[PDB]
Structure formats: structure tokens, C-alpha cells
Scaffold this active site. Structure first.
Site, PDB file in Angstrom:
ATOM      1  N   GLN B  10       0.809  -1.004  -0.037  1.00 22.14           N
ATOM      2  CA  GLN B  10      -0.017  -0.081  -0.010  1.00 22.14           C
ATOM      3  C   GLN B  10       0.855   1.374  -0.041  1.00 22.14           C
ATOM      4  OE1 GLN B  10      -2.776   0.145   3.340  1.00 22.14           O
ATOM      5  NE2 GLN B  10      -3.676   2.233   2.498  1.00 22.14           N
ATOM      6  N   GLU B  61      -4.347  -6.536  -0.388  1.00 26.16           N
ATOM      7  CA  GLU B  61      -5.370  -5.278  -0.123  1.00 26.16           C
ATOM      8  C   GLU B  61      -5.914  -4.646  -1.314  1.00 26.16           C
ATOM      9  OE1 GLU B  61      -7.678  -5.087   2.480  1.00 26.16           O
ATOM     10  OE2 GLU B  61      -6.902  -6.733   3.411  1.00 26.16           O
ATOM     11  N   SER B 130       7.529  -0.052   1.368  1.00 27.35           N
ATOM     12  CA  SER B 130       8.076   0.429   2.397  1.00 27.35           C
ATOM     13  C   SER B 130       8.582  -0.755   3.329  1.00 27.35           C
ATOM     14  CB  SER B 130       6.952   0.735   3.518  1.00 27.35           C
ATOM     15  OG  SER B 130       7.398   0.946   4.664  1.00 27.35           O
ATOM     16  N   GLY B 134       3.327  -5.462   5.455  1.00 27.11           N
ATOM     17  CA  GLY B 134       3.414  -7.013   5.349  1.00 27.11           C
ATOM     18  C   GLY B 134       3.364  -7.245   3.986  1.00 27.11           C
ATOM     19  N   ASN B 196       9.051   8.583   7.269  1.00 26.56           N
ATOM     20  CA  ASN B 196       7.693   9.321   7.313  1.00 26.56           C
ATOM     21  C   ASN B 196       7.813  10.326   8.366  1.00 26.56           C
ATOM     22  OD1 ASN B 196       6.098   8.425   5.056  1.00 26.56           O
ATOM     23  ND2 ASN B 196       5.682   6.715   6.440  1.00 26.56           N
ATOM     24  N   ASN B 217       4.204  11.934  -0.607  1.00 25.26           N
ATOM     25  CA  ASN B 217       4.746  11.020  -1.624  1.00 25.26           C
ATOM     26  C   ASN B 217       5.287  11.735  -2.739  1.00 25.26           C
ATOM     27  OD1 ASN B 217       4.584   8.430  -0.178  1.00 25.26           O
ATOM     28  ND2 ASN B 217       2.206   8.532  -1.094  1.00 25.26           N
ATOM     29  N   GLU B 243      25.971   4.014 -11.809  1.00 26.87           N
ATOM     30  CA  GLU B 243      26.862   4.656 -11.178  1.00 26.87           C
ATOM     31  C   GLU B 243      26.350   5.322  -9.662  1.00 26.87           C
ATOM     32  OE1 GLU B 243      27.693   8.197 -13.812  1.00 26.87           O
ATOM     33  OE2 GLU B 243      29.407   7.202 -15.077  1.00 26.87           O
TER      34      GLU B 243
END
Ligand SMILES: Nc1nc2c(ncn2[C@@H]2O[C@H](COP(=O)(O)OP(=O)(O)O)[C@@H](O)[C@H]2O)c(=O)[nH]1
Ligand SMILES: Nc1nc2c(ncn2[C@@H]2O[C@H](COP(=O)(O)OP(=O)(O)O)[C@@H](O)[C@H]2O)c(=O)[nH]1
Ligand SMILES: Nc1nc2c(ncn2[C@@H]2O[C@H](COP(=O)(O)OP(=O)(O)O)[C@@H](O)[C@H]2O)c(=O)[nH]1
Lengths: 238, 410, 433, 410
Positions: B10, B61, B130, B134, B196, B217, B243
Site C-alpha cells: 500500500q 488488499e 516500505s 506486510g 515518514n 509522496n 553509477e
């Protein structure tokens, strides 16, 4: 630019189309499998077996996500993975995956199906390679009975299992039973001329009868068989 | 030189809504995918007008893409470049890696393979997720294995989002990092760790408006773009993805990069953008500073940035910076340029900084792991879903090595 | 100068001629969408071979000597939308019904209706000519109009004039797939005319023209926009000797071309080839010299024909160079190797009619065009003779030919008259061996 | 080249609701008849903006047009281009041909004649009906007589809908075909036989929704349009209506064509559209295949279909097809193109296929006629309404000849 690269491009587009179709309509899983089988074949031919495996696993995941479980579809998908493993030379895994296919069918209705009889034949052949004769014989007999009940005694599939049993018995030097099997195969294969059976299978039966008769000490009937196979293989040049 | 993108979890797919709305702006395309610069990098040319992006929107999800492919962006992504499956890798690494991961990983790879056989110069993977959840961290750890096992000679850049040091946001989240930061350390050639807490603060100073994870984001989605905009908006000092491994990753473990963006059509006169780029508060991680010396910083200055200024600006910046003792006096900072700024900006800047401070992110995520693992504090959700304590302590012993590998790099 | 009319029959002939007068006008520096040249300046080359002075202001339109005839309206209305005031719209004749794979509509039918109107416009062109010395009828040998009215018109034109060459630049049926179901019929009905009343029938084949734009012009799907440009560049290549009076231009008229290429009156089906087939993407360092264009002229997959040219006997050959040449003795000495390499026909000691034109092509700087009168061109027509017989043992389609006015006695004559054609190279192959 | 259209029967007028909502879309007109390409073909230019179509909505049971001219399409059709009369040709050929047919046929012809004296290039009749009912098949059989007796040199294309092989849908329906298929065989120059069993199946695979006879007719309404869209959207290989008789009808009886459509804005890459066009399951009739070889197939590929591909695609398709022995090796398949796809599609395809399999449709409708006629099984509804058994057995002896005329064409 190569012919195989062209076949792959075509087969990939056709798979991508079936993937998108199954995005818009998640139910259309059967058609995705068919398109995948063609592309997976080509990946095998070029030796990319992991790509072929990934395709079939993808087919399998889609089948597994159906809200109405289709065990027949899963059976078929597992048997395609089994065959993939077999051509890859992963003999244990091929047996394991045919066995998974059979277990899904046994738990639902599908004991006496077309797929199941095929799987039992192919599994029996792997057991022959594993040198487990009794297990091979068992499955071949089951495939034989099922094809007998599904098709007539007079069918290509019945004669094929007869042939496969013949080679099994011959390889364990049960010459008598090898003979019975190959003759039953011969009897059927003669009565079936058209595109429902190619003549090269008929030549194999004579070839196999030849080795059986020779093992039986009937060198006369042996050469007669080896002759008729040669006549057949020659006659398909025209 | 055509970079595939993967957006797992997500957190990653919500960046994909930000990234592919910024990749379409910088290349100047409409939201449907057609033409309103090397457009071949991110976008697969399907037809003469329409450019389908090289993104998999891999997700459990499936409501995140229902936001994406419901409102305004359904025509953009190809639906044979996706996966949507319930259940949802239940903020549980073992669901995302093993239980609901092995269900989709045959579909993930065969959608990647159907997107990289359309290429014609594949170079990289901007895999965006992230290390917290999960799905982004579990299935993100699984894709990194299977993609390196399939493409062992291609650069895999992971654009992670670290759990916040501020509070959790998930209970079992320090487990899910170390189970993922293992597989990033083993497979990915260079990771950008984002945070965050810093993404809240820098966006709080950016906007006169309290941010949300769409506004956070857009800091990431520029950093995701600015890393690979010397690859598609060439300019001078062409810095490819090869590089960012040779220059910024000295030792075979230290490949977790802390990226800033500046300015935070916005113009900036640029003796102060270099002071804004290498501001300690503009780096997007809660890295250590009072006990932190850099290893190798980068500076990708895009837009109307002419290279004469960095002889006066960036040489002044690198004196202000703190490098390791084994980095030279004016050296240790690679540079690059693009000939086109992002849309909305007129001169931007990026700074991938490999720094010992990112071990303090690692040391936090081990000090949280230290108490939480020995007391079995969420462990049975892994044990009863495939992943044992042997497999999880071994994940710690690499990150405890990795947290030491920066302390060995001072 | 020797004027020359390009009559354009059928959809396949018009869509070549839609692209042919695009080329020729651009070749003479004339706007292909208005007919007018650049203002005040003369057109390059000798315009009056194909064109006519309309308006004496030196900036007005130049009407091409071209009548476009087709029984379907949509083809010429496509041309009228894509030519502007270029053509004379009294020559752009169209009808309503069309023919539709029926020879006996273009020949004896709706094409019989247009024949008093078509010939009243050839008479308008020929009287407007200085002294016309060739009529290049562009059609197909597959359809109902191009193969129907093209068989009618050419037999209505040599019957009227007779002292004029009729080079029927025509498009044979592709053997890979037939674009018309009655297409091996319609050829044999046109092989009556294109053998008897045409002085030469320059063939083209849609299979070879696909391969010479796919493998040679390196595109995926060669459209009919590019089939009618491979043909065009060849038709604007065989007519560069007719239209240009340059430095050392060997000015080859049609009669001057066909005296070198029609050995005896039943051997005038000519193939063609073009060099270089370099794609238009400016392959400047891969531009071909004259020693190697001729190596690419005579490949089996280089002629515009279904047959394999070097697998049979080149009876009469005419290699038309066109463009900037530096090397005259390196020219003709590559052909000296090609006198040895290629299967020629003693029955003829030597035959290479070599045109030079210093005015270069549009797409190419050093361009070469071949016209090989081959014996293999019966092997294209052996397929058509065989596909006719499979559709005559059954007595195929129906009454469709027979209800219009033709007879079963007549159709068996025209099969024999195409059998007389195919044997006429079979006479000339083994006697030429 | 301006094609008149006739829509007789409830089956035909329900196609007219589908066809003149697709003819307005492909020509780009609004539903009222005004301007939102050769628009002269289907539409009579009344004024500068408004285009009234060249359709008669000839009908008994006047509730079908009450759906048409009630809701959204009353302004479109001209009401001097219609007929509405009760009673309703009571699924009875003798009502539609003789009883309630002779009441309207003076009005039908004088409305056709008032629509073709406005023309200025009349070429064809896309007469749309079924061969099943009593209005589409009875009065459809009467119009075909009177129109050929009035215009014996104009092509009359009948767009029939065969009774289903699945079940009846009308009791006396195999009578009504053979009484109509006689007069189609005698008057119409080429018929397209369509089948609601195939129109159910192909629409079932098209939509993710169970079809209805509005959704079935959009397969027909494209086929009705695609036949005559090389006549109005010219392109290359201009195929008029005169070339669907010379090319596709070999013998003077074999003029019953089986038309497919593909793709079933939808794009298709087109090596697979030719495999979709000549799919055996995409042909819209239950024709025979295991005992069926073609006579003459067609292929009208509209839209963004360039002609180079058919040298590789269609030559591959024609090797896969089964033609008669008296058709050549690569020949036997005519082609065509249009320069404009239908609205909603980007590259379409059509395939009028004259095939021996359509005699199995004829053999079904004779084997149903064989039992049903000899036992007088609905015959007295014809006898007590004008049509004797002599007139009805003579209808059989032509169709039994016609079912043999394809078996003579193998
Ligand atoms: N930068 C950013 N972080 C997010 C976003 N959404 C969630 N996160 C953070 O990402 C972490 C992981 O959640 P996530 O990986 O999305 O859960 P999963 O997808 O179920 O694996 C959480 O701790 C959130 O704080 C987003 O849109 N942008
Ligand atoms: N080279 C070329 N050939 C074409 C073109 N269009 C059609 N053909 C070929 O011409 C043949 C007959 O078509 P045509 O004579 O136009 O039919 P008609 O208009 O009914 O007489 C077919 O076999 C096609 O293969 C084109 O644009 N270029
Ligand atoms: N394709 C199609 N078939 C229809 C439609 N409506 C009815 N049919 C079929 O057409 C056949 C004939 O009915 P019809 O001719 O309408 O009866 P009539 O108008 O009273 O003569 C029936 O067997 C129906 O299955 C429609 O809208 N589309």
C-alpha cells in the site's frame, strides 16, 4: 529475426491478451491456460524452464482464486507442471505433481475422467523410470480400465496404454504378458486408419512385438514384425 | 536504458499514484497515457500516441489500485501489469513472503518477464515500497529475491519507507523491517531509505497545509524521479543507475541511501539550493548527525543549473560536510545534471547520501527488535505462517552486522 | 518531345497512378496537390513528356496526360481529394456500380458504357500531344475493372491507333493468397488482351512487393501505400529516359524500349526490378555503388514478380541506370560479370539495353531499374493457367461471366490463348537453353 | 451509390433500432438526425443539417416502432418512410404475404418509390428481417418479389435471421423459412443468414452480461454496416455491393452468406483479428464444419488495417480454411478495406463466407419441414389464408434443390 523468436512474440502477445481478458473478466481462466501452454512449450524448446514454470504457476494462482473452485482445471494445471518437470529431467518432481493432480481429482468427483486416466498413464511411466514396477503396473491398469469405460475398447488411447504396459512387462522380462498387451494393442491399432491414429504408432507396435517374439524364441514371427514395421516407415514417404 | 518499476504494498502503490502522476508531467503526457526527452525509460511505447508505463502495481488488499484505477487513472496502467488479491498480507511478513506471497509471485514474475521482454535495454528496477508493512515489506522482500535470482546482473533500486522513529504505525513493524532489510542487503544494489517522520516535517515546511500521504509522496516521487532523470533527461555528466552503485556504495553492505530534494514555477538562484540540498533537516531520514560522518554523497542538480557554480558552491558544501577519514579532501561527492527540471520547478536538486547515520535507523530497528524478539512479542504470527525464529534471528545477525558495518566505516 | 499517356484503370492501377503522379510531379518540381509549379520558374526536366501546358502564364497548372478510369466512384474521389486542381477532371471518369471481380462487367458491361467517354478523352489527349509515342496503361490483371476494362481499353486503342506502344504496367495476382475469388479467371481473360493487343505488359506481383518492402525497406507491415511506391519508383524509373533530356541521357522511348525487349510478338511480358532498395531512413554510409547495386538487381528476391528470376532464362534485359554516375567503365563491366552469372538465352547473343539518366530519383541518388523479359514469367502464368483449370473442370463460379454476354466457347479460347502464351516461353526456354 | 434500407418485421425493426443507432455513430450524427465520409449512402439530405435515413420501417404489430418513435428516435425517421398496421401478420406467412401483406404492399412500394426517386445513384437494398416470423418472413417475402419486379437490375441484399436450431421460438417457424427462403433464392442477389443461437453465444463471449435482442443486434448492426462500409468509407480495395454477388456467389443458387465480425476504443494488433475473423465459432450461423468446405470467403477489414499484413495473415488464414476442390490454392478469398472503423472500435473485420455449411441450416429447415408438412401440422393456417399445399411443397422443392446445390458445390 529467427523462427523461434517469431513464434515466441506471437505466443507472448496471445498470452498477454488472455491475461488482460482475465483482468477484465476474472472467470476466463481456462483460455489463459491454453495460451500459456503454447508459450510454455516454446520456452521449454529454448531451455528457459524457469520461465515455463512461472507461466504455469501463474495459471495455477488464477485458478486458485476462483470463487467457485474448479478442481478439473487445477488437476490439468498440475499435470502441465508435472510434464514440464518431466521434460526438464526433474523426475521426482514430475511424479509429485502428477500425484497432486490425482489427489485433487480423487477428493472431488473426478476419479473417472479423461485427464485422470491420462495422468495415471503418464505417472505410471515415471514410476517405470523410478524402477517401481508394481506402482507402474497399478497405475497403467487403472488408466486402461478408465479409457475402456470412456472410449470403446476400440480406441487410440486404449491401445496406447496397452502398448505402455507391453513395454513395462517387456522391460521386467515378463515376456508372456508383454505379448498379450502388444497383441491387444495391434488388434486395436489395425482397425483405426484415419487421422484418429498416425501410422508411426502402428510401426512401434510391430517393432515392440518384434522384440517380444524374439525374447519368446519365435524368431520367425519376430522378423515378420520387424519387416512390417520397415514396410510402414518406408510407405510414409510416398 | 529502460527502467522497470515495481510498486509493491500500500505504501508503494500510493507512491505509484504520486510517481506516475509526476512521471507523466515531467515527460509531458496526459493522465490517459497519450502524448499531450527519453520517454522509453519509464514508458513502453504500445502505439504511436499511447505510452503505457513499465510499472507492476503488485498489491494485496486490492483497494489501493481501486483508488488508482477507479477515478482518473484506469486508462493509464495496463491491467496485465498488475496483481490484486485478497487477503492482504496482513501486516505480517510471513503472509507477504510465504503465505500470500507464493500465491502471487508466479504472477508477479511472469508480468515482470512480460514487461522486460518488451525491452530493448533493461537496466534497472525502481522497486517502490516500505519496509514497514506486510505487503510492501513481505512481498517486497520476496520480489527482491526472485528478481535477483532472475536478473543477477541488473541494478535493483529499492525505494523503501522506513518505520517512523516517532511512533510505530504498526505493532509488528520492527520485525517487518529486519526481515526485509535482510533481503534488501542481500539482493538490492542500492536502497533509498525514506522516513515518514522527515517526510512529515519537510512537507510541513513545504506546504502551508498539514500534509497527507499523497503530499508526502510527492517528495518521494521527485526523489524516485530525480535519481533516474539523468538517465532520461541526459544533459551533462550523465549519471546512469550503474553509477549509483560504483560511486555511492563503498563497501559491499553500505548501500542504504538518504535522499534529499530541493527546492523545498519555483526558481532558486543556486548558491542556496546547494545549502538547501545538503541541509541536515532536508535529508529524508532521521539519521544521526552528532555521531555521523558521511561516506559518499551525490548531487543530481536538474534543470537550469549550470556546472560552473558547483566549483564555488559544491566545493563550499563539501567543506561544510563531514566525511569519513578515508575520503579525500575535495573529493567524495559525485555530481550530475539533467537538461530538464521537473514540471512545477525550474531548478531542482537531489542528494543520495551514503552516511553512517543510516545505521542509527538500523540501530533503532535492532533495539526495537532486541526486546521484541526475545520476549516472543509478536513472533507467533510468523511461526504459525511459515517463518521460524531461526529464520528471524538470522535476519537480525545481518542487520546487526550492517549496523556495525557503518560503525566500521567511520 | 515524345509524349506519353498514363491511363489508370481499376482501383489497383489508380492507386499506383495516385502515387505515380505524386512522384512524377515532385520529380519535375511541380506541386502534386495543385498542378502548378513553383511561381515563375520552369519545371525541371522535360515536363511535356507526361504533362500539358494549361494556362500560358508560366505559373499555372500542368495537367498530366492521364485518364483515370474506374467503375467504382470511391477510388477517383480519393484521388480528387488528394490531387486538387492537378488532373483534368474531365479525365477523372468514374461510375457508380463498379465491376467486382467480374471481367465481363469491365469488358462487356459498365466498361462498355464508359468506352465512348474514355476514348473521347484519349482522343483529347493524343490530339493535344506533339507526337505521342507510348501509352502506359496502369491496371491490375486480377480484378473486374483493371483486368476487365484494361483488356477492353487496350484492345480499343491499338485497334484505333496501332502505331503506338501500349506498355500495360500491370499488377499480377499474388500466388500466396488471391485478393479476388475470380482472380485466376480474370487474368486469363486479360491475357487475351495483354498478349495480343498490348505491345508489352510490365508485370508486378503483390507477394514480391511485400517482400521488397519488408526485408528491404525494413518495415513490419508494407501497406498499399508502399506497394504503390515500389511500383511507382520503378514506373518513375522506366520513364526517366522518356522525360529527361540531360547531360548524356540515353533517351529511350517506349518503342525504343520495346524493340530491345520484345523479341517476337508473343514474348512481351516483362518483369522489373529496382536498386537500391535502401530504406528512406538516410543510410548514407550504406549507399550502394554500381558494382553492388547490380549484385542486388539480380537476386531471386529482388524482382517485382512471384517467380524466381535466376532460376530461369533472362531472354531480353534492359538495365536502366538513373542518377549521378561517376563510373561509366565500371558500369557495363559489372554487367559483363552478369553476362556470365545470369541465365541468358542464346537465341540472343547479347541483350542489355542500358539507359543512363543524369537526373536522379527523388528517393535515391544512384538508382537502378531493371526490365528483364524473363522466361520465368510463364511460371507465374503457369500458376494462373493451373488455377484456371481447377476453376474450369468444376466450371466455377456460375453464370456470372456467361450471363453478361460471354460464351463457354469463348472462355476455352482464352484459356488456350493463355496456353499459347505460356508455351510461347516454353518454346523460348528450351530453344533458348 | 446510395443504399435504400427496408426493415420489415419485428426482428428487422429491432435491428433498425440497432442499425440506425450505429449508422448515426459511424457517420457521426446525433440521434435527432442532424450533424454532430459518404453520408449520402444511408441518409437522404433533406436540409443542410438534418439527414433523414433511407429506411422504411415497414411493420405490422405497430408497437415496435412505438418503442422507436416514442422514446428517443421519433425525430430521426421520416413518418412518410414507415407503415404501421394492425393486425400483425400473425406469425403466419399467409397473413404477411397475402392477407395483411396486400393491404400494405401498395403503401410499401410507393414509400420505397418516394425514397428512390430522391436518388441520384441507387444501388442496393439492405432489407433487414428474419425468415422466422410472419411479418419479417411473410411480408419480407412479398417485398422481395415486388422490389425485384420493380428494380430487376439492382442488388437486393437480405439480412435474415434464421430460426434457431436450439429450439423453435415459434411453432410454425420452419414453414415460414421455406416459404421465405424460396423468395430470397428467387429475388435477392445475396442473403446474409444470421442465427440467434450464434448471436447468443458470440454476444455471451463478448459481454460480461447476459445478452438481449438489443445486444444481439449490435453484432448484426455492425455486419449490416460493415458489408456496406467499403461503399461509404472508401479506403483502398473499394468493394461495392455489386462485388458481393460476382465474387461470393459462384452458382446461381449459392447466395446465402455467413458473416462474422471481429473484434469480439477496442484495438487489436491484427495477426489475431484474422484468426478471430475466421474463427469457426465467430461465424454467425450454426453451419456445418466437419462436412463443410467453403466456396468463397470475403474479408472486409475496416479502420487501422494496413494491406501489407494480409499477405502474411490472410494467406495464412486461407491455408487454414477448407475450400472446395475447384477453388485455387491461395485464391478464393476477396478482400476489402475502409478508412474508418466503427465508433467504439479501432480496427474491425467482416467475413462474408459462402459455404456448404449453410446447407445444413437448409437441411435442418427441410428436415423440420419434412415431418411438419406431410402431417398438415400447421398447414391449415396457410390454407385458410390463401396459400395452398401446392404453393408450399413447391417452396420445398426449391430449398431441397438449394440444399443439394451446396452438396453439388463440394
Ligand atoms: N511515504 C508514505 N508512507 C506511507 C504511505 N502509506 C503508508 N505509509 C507508511 O508505510 C508503512 C507501511 O505500511 P504498508 O507497507 O503500506 O502496509 P502493507 O501495504 O499492508 O504492507 C506504514 O508504517 C505507514 O506509516 C504513503 O502513501 N506514503
Ligand atoms: N500494387 C497494388 N495492388 C493493388 C492495390 N489495390 C489492389 N491491388 C490488387 O489489384 C487486384 C485487383 O483489384 P482491382 O482491379 O482494383 O479491382 P476492380 O476495381 O474491381 O477492378 C487485387 O488482386 C489486388 O491485390 C494497390 O493499391 N496497389
Ligand atoms: N437477432 C434478432 N432476432 C430476433 C429479434 N427479435 C426476435 N428475433 C427472432 O426473430 C424470429 C422471428 O420473429 P419475427 O420475424 O420478429 O416475428 P414477426 O415480426 O411477427 O414476423 C424469432 O424466432 C426470434 O427468435 C431481434 O431483435 N434480434
Amino acid at each position: 529475426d529467427t523462427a523461434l523468436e517469431r513464434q515466441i512474440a506471437s505466443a507472448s502477445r496471445s498470452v498477454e491478451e488472455a491475461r488482460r481478458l482475465a483482468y477484465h473478466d476474472p472467470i476466463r481462466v481456462g483460455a489463459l491456460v491454453e495460451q500459456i501452454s503454447v508459450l510454455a512449450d516454446l520456452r521449454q524448446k529454448e531451455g528457459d524452464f524457469r520461465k515455463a514454470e512461472s507461466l504455469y504457476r501463474e495459471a495455477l494462482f488464477r485458478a486458485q482464486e476462483l470463487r467457485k473452485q474448479d478442481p478439473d482445471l487445477l488437476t490439468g494445471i498440475y499435470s502441465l507442471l508435472a510434464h514440464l518437470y518431466d521434460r526438464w529431467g526433474r523426475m521426482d518432481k514430475a511424479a509429485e505433481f502428477y500425484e497432486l493432480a490425482l489427489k485433487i481429482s480423487a477428493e472431488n468427483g473426478l476419479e473417472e475422467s479423461d485427464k485422470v486416466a491420462t495422468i495415471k498413464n503418464n505417472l505410471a511411466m515415471i514410476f517405470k523410470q523410478l524402477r517401481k514396477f508394481e506402482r507402474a503396473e497399478g497405475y497403467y491398469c487403472e488408466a486402461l480400465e478408465t479409457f475402456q469405460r470412456l472410449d470403446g475398447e476400440q480406441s487410440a488411447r486404449v491401445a496406447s496404454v496397452y502398448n505402455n504396459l507391453g513395454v513395462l512387462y517387456y522391460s521386467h522380462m515378463d515376456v508372456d504378458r508383454a505379448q498379450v498387451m502388444h497383441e491387444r494393442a495391434l488388434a486395436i491399432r489395425q482397425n483405426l486408419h484415419e487421422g484418429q491414429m498416425d501410422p508411426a504408432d502402428l510401426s512401434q507396435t510391430f517393432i515392440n512385438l518384434g522384440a517380444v517374439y524374439k525374447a519368446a524364441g519365435d524368431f520367425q514371427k519376430a522378423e515378420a514384425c520387424v519387416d512390417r514395421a520397415k514396410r510402414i516407415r518406408a510407405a510414409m514417404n510416398g | 536504458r529502460e527502467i522497470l518499476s515495481i510498486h509493491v504494498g500500500q505504501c508503494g502503490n500510493q507512491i505509484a499514484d504520486s510517481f506516475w502522476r509526476l512521471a507523466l508531467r515531467e515527460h509531458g503526457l496526459t493522465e490517459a497515457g497519450t502524448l499531450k526527452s527519453n520517454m522509453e525509460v519509464f514508458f513502453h511505447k504500445v502505439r504511436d500516441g499511447k505510452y503505457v508505463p513499465r510499472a507492476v502495481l503488485v498489491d494485496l488488499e486490492p483497494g489501493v489500485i481501486a483508488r488508482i484505477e477507479g477515478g482518473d487513472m484506469s486508462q493509464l496502467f495496463d491491467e496485465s501489469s498488475i496483481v490484486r488479491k485478497i487477503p492482504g498480507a496482513a501486516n505480517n511478513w510471513a503472509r507477504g513472503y510465504n503465505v500470500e506471497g507464493e500465491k502471487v509471485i508466479d504472477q508477479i514474475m511472469n508480468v515482470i518477464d512480460s514487461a522486460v521482454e518488451k525491452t530493448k535495454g533493461l537496466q534497472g528496477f525502481l522497486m517502490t515500497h516500505s519496509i514497514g508493512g506486510g505487503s510492501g515489506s513481505g512481498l517486497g522482500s520476496l520480489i527482491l529475491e526472485r528478481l535477483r535470482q532472475a536478473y543477477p546482473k541488473k541494478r535493483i533500486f529499492t525505494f523503501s519507507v522506513v518505520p517512523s522513529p516517532l511512533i510505530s504505525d504498526s505493532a509488528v513493524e520492527p520485525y517487518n523491517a529486519i526481515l526485509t532489510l535482510q533481503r534488501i542487503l542481500d539482493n538490492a544494489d542500492g536502497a533509498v531509505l525514506l522516513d515518514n517522520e522527515a517526510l512529515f516535517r519537510i512537507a510541513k515546511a513545504k506546504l502551508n497545509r498539514s500534509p497527507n500521504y499523497m503530499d508526502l509522496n510527492n517528495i518521494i516521487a521527485l526523489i524516485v524521479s530525480s535519481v533516474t532523470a539523468s538517465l532520461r533527461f541526459p544533459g551533462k555528466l550523465n549519471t546512469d543507475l550503474s553509477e549509483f552503485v560504483t560511486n555511492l556504495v563503498p563497501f559491499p553492505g553500505n548501500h542504504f541511501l538518504t535522499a534529499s530534494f530541493a527546492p523545498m514555477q519555483v526558481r532558486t538562484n543556486f548558491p542556496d539550493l546547494a545549502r538547501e540540498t545538503f541541509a541536515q533537516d532536508n535529508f529524508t531520514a532521521a539519521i544521526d548527525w552528532q555521531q555521523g560522518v558521511y561516506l559518499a554523497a551525490s548531487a543530481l542538480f536538474r534543470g537550469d543549473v549550470k556546472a560552473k557554480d558547483v566549483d564555488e558552491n559544491m566545493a563550499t558544501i563539501r567543506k561544510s560536510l563531514n566525511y569519513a577519514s578515508y575520503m579525500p579532501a575535495s573529493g567524495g561527492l559525485k555530481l550530475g545534471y539533467a537538461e530538464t527540471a521537473p514540471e512545477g520547478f525550474a531548478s531542482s536538486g537531489l542528494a543520495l547520501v551514503n552516511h553512517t547515520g543510516i545505521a542509527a535507523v538500523f540501530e533503532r530497528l535492532i533495539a526495537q527488535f532486541d526486546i521484541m524478539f526475545d520476549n516472543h512479542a509478536y513472533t507467533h504470527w510468523y511461526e504459525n505462517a511459515g517463518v521460524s525464529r531461526d529464520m528471524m534471528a538470522k535476519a537480525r545477525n545481518q542487520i546487526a552486522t550492517l549496523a556495525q558495518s557503518y560503525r566500521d566505516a567511520s | 518531345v515524345n509524349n506519353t499517356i498514363v491511363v489508370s484503370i481499376g482501383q489497383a492501377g489508380n492507386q499506383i497512378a495516385a502515387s505515380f503522379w505524386k512522384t512524377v510531379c515532385l520529380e519535375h518540381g511541380i506541386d502534386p496537390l495543385t498542378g502548378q509549379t513553383a511561381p515563375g520558374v520552369a519545371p525541371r526536366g522535360n515536363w511535356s513528356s507526361f504533362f500539358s501546358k494549361l494556362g500560358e502564364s508560366s505559373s499555372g497548372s500542368y495537367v498530366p496526360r492521364a485518364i483515370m478510369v474506374d467503375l467504382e466512384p470511391s477510388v477517383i474521389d480519393n484521388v480528387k481529394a488528394t490531387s486538387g486542381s492537378l488532373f483534368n477532371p474531365a479525365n477523372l471518369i468514374s461510375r457508380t456500380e463498379g465491376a467486382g471481380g467480374n471481367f465481363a462487367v469491365g469488358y462487356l458491361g459498365a466498361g462498355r458504357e464508359v468506352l465512348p467517354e474514355v476514348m473521347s478523352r484519349l482522343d483529347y489527349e493524343i490530339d493535344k500531344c506533339d507526337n505521342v509515342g507510348g501509352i502506359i496503361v496502369l491496371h491490375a490483371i486480377g480484378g473486374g475493372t483493371g483486368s476487365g476494362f484494361g483488356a477492353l481499353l487496350i484492345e480499343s486503342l491499338k485497334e484505333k491507333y496501332g502505331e503506338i506502344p501500349v506498355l500495360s504496367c500491370a499488377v499480377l495476382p499474388s500466388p500466396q493468397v488471391s485478393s479476388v475469388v475470380t482472380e485466376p479467371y480474370n487474368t486469363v481473360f486479360a491475357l487475351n488482351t495483354l498478349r495480343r493487343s498490348a505491345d508489352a505488359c510490365l508485370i508486378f506481383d503483390n507477394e514480391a512487393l511485400f517482400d521488397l518492402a519488408h526485408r528491404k525497406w525494413n518495415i513490419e507491415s508494407p501497406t498499399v501505400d508502399d506497394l504503390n511506391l515500389l511500383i511507382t519508383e520503378a514506373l518513375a524509373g522506366i520513364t526517366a529516359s522518356m522525360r529527361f533530356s540531360g547531360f548524356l541521357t540515353v533517351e529511350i522511348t517506349l518503342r525504343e524500349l520495346l524493340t530491345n525487349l520484345v523479341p517476337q510478338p508473343s514474348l512481351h511480358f516483362l518483369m522489373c526490378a529496382f536498386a537500391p532498395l535502401t530504406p528512406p531512413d538516410r543510410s548514407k554510409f550504406e549507399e550502394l555503388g554500381i558494382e553492388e547495386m547490380i549484385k542486388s538487381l539480380f537476386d531471386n528476391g529482388s524482382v517485382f514478380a512471384a517467380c524466381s528470376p535466376m532460376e530461369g532464362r533472362f531472354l531480353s534485359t534492359a538495365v536502366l541506370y538513373r542518377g549521378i554516375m561517376e563510373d561509366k567503365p565500371l558500369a557495363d563491366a559489372a554487367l559483363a560479370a552478369m553476362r556470365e552469372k545470369l541465365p541468358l538465352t542464346y537465341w540472343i547473343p547479347t541483350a542489355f539495353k542500358i539507359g543512363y539518366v543524369e537526373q536522379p530519383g527523388i528517393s535515391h541518388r544512384k538508382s537502378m531499374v531493371l526490365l528483364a523479359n524473363n522466361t520465368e514469367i510463364a511460371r507465374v502464368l503457369d500458376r494462373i493457367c493451373h488455377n484456371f483449370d481447377k476453376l474450369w473442370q468444376r466450371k466455377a463460379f456460375a453464370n456470372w461471366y456467361l450471363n453478361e454476354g460471354m460464351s463457354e466457347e469463348q472462355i476455352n479460347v482464352l484459356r488456350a490463348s493463355a496456353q499459347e502464351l505460356v508455351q510461347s516461353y516454353q518454346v523460348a526456354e528450351e530453344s533458348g537453353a
